[PDB]
Amino acid sequence: MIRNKAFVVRLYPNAAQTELINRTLGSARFVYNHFLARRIAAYKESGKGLTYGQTSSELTLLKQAEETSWLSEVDKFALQNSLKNLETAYKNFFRTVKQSGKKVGFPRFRKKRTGESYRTQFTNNNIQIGEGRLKLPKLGWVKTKGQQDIQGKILNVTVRRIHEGHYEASVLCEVEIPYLPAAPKFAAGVDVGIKDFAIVTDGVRFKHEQNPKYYRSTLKRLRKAQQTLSRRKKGSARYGKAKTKLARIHKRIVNKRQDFLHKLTTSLVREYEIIGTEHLDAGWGEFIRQLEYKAAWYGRLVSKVSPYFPSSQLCHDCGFKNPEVKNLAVRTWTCPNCGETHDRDENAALNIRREALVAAGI
DNA sequence: GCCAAGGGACTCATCAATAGAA
RNA sequence: GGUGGCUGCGGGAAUCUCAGACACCUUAAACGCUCAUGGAGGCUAUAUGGUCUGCGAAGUGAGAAUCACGCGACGUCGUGUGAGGUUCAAGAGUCCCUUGGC
DNA sequence: TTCTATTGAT
Ligand SMILES: [Zn+2]
């Protein structure tokens, strides 16, 4: 019943806290690079990889050294977790060395990039959560907007810089999540359509989860923005402004899609005991990920149809397969075996529901 | 050699000691 | 007078308040804006068609777009601090890889 | 000066 859960809140640090955040990110990156180089040199020297303990000790001697004493300014937890990041990169590489086929590459030097994070643990109430405030080590109280009810025991806080002037902190808390009570409906079947994002059916009726309002309208504004950027010559300030506006429109599209999927998946979890989706505008990967983790948290069970199931071809009533349904132009078709005409999307959702129950076994 | 966006695999600290301060 | 929406802030989405503007006349559709410069093109639908434009299109440079309070400068501007309604929803981190663009 | 916040070693 106790789950690792993350609460993302937007940070609004003042000038000094922003300076300290940037210093901490730089220090973490420098430590990662330096001790990657040190491990490589050690393997070249003695043929034995340095343990995390040996890398930790040299960091402590690095901190006291005059040439690298500046690391004392930033939080210790950030540097040590950067060292743990290096160790995990090495661990991934070592695990994949034996395996054939897909192989994790050797760790590479960390480079300056817009999205960087530093992670600080919790100990002796150094992290405290108030109403509209958040306390982080070495920083003090920082004002947070959109702070939900944060419960459980705080484990660590990940301070992330999405882009310049945009900071988000992901507070990891070990919160107990109570199971949702019995759902009004038993099971659902979910599809993919062109005009409609999905066709959710409980068996009594079909509910068309159409695309969110203004989604097609926003896609129009996406096309307009690209035209202006394309004709604009590169390197101009107005070209930069057009690129920023295009980036903002992309961000709005992503946010609207995520909100639509979050509300839809929460509704599916609350409304149906068992949810069944075929595994494959779509954004299907995030939909499946959210459905699976929310079902695990709230006690629902997700049954994913085997991709070998050709639901669209089969008729729900009789199971006859028709090659005509393979053609997309055939939105409405009649099954000669069952002598019935049914909508393609409606027939697909009912079949996906039927297979979802079979896989769960009920 | 340089940036952005997706995807798959694995995972999500604790405590004794100690310096300092309102 | 009534109706709709483009752009900006209000954690995300819708609504709404306000603001930059504006369209039309009971139908809701379309479009962010200002200044300077620029010198015939710009947008949409199905190679074809429609609309804007030369008392100025694309492109380039600059700027403003909620509220309260303090400070400085010349009623005005610059700066910092603080605040922003109602309803629904919010699981992230690390590593490598892939793709796209330079 | 006892409570608060940070550090090094696992
Ligand atoms: Zn049939």
Q: Are A109 and A36 in contact (CB under 8 A)?
A: yes
> Is A343 known to be catalytic?
no
If asked whether residues A108 and A10 sit together in one domain, one would say yes
Kindly report the three-state secondary structure assignment for every residue of A220-289. HHHHHHHHHHHHCCCCCHHHHHHHHHHHHHHHHHHHHHHHHHHHHHHHHHHHEEEEEEECCCCCHHHHHH
Span CA (A344) to C1' (C11), Å: 41
Task: Check if A278 is active-site.
Answer: yes
CATH number at residue A322: 3.30.420
Are A169 and A134 spatial neighbours (Cβ–Cβ below 8 Å)?
Answer: yes
> Which domain covers residue A16, as residue numbers?
2-176
Residue A93: CB atoms within 10 A of its CB come to 14
Q: Within a 10 A sphere around the Cβ of A205, how many other Cβ atoms? A: 8
A60 found inside a domain: yes
> Alpha carbon of A190 to those of A93, A198, A292, A312, A356: distances in Å?
38, 6, 14, 13, 10
Write the DSSP symbol of residue A63.
H
A92 CA to C70 C1' in angstroms comes to 56
DSSP H or E segment with residue A10: strand A2-12
Q: CB of A112 under 7 A from strand B?
A: yes
Q: What 3-state class would DSSP assign to A46? A: helix
**Alpha-carbon gap, residue A169 to A149, rounded angstroms:** 15
Residues, CB within 5 angstroms of ligand 1 (ion)? A 315, 318, 320, 335, 338
Domain count, chain A: 2
Residue ending a domain, among A152, A176, A200, is: A176
Rounded Cα gap, residues A48 and A37, in angstroms? 14
Same domain, A48 and A141: yes
The phi and psi torsions of A53 (rounded to 5 degrees) equal: -65, -45
Query: What approach was used to elucidate this structure?
Result: cryo-EM
Resolution, in Å, please?
A: 3.1
Q: What is the torsion angle, in degrees rounded to the nearest 10, for the CA atoms of residue A260, residue A263, residue A267 and residue A273? A: 90
Domain match, A112 and A148 both: yes
In whole angstroms, C26 C1' to A221 CA is 29
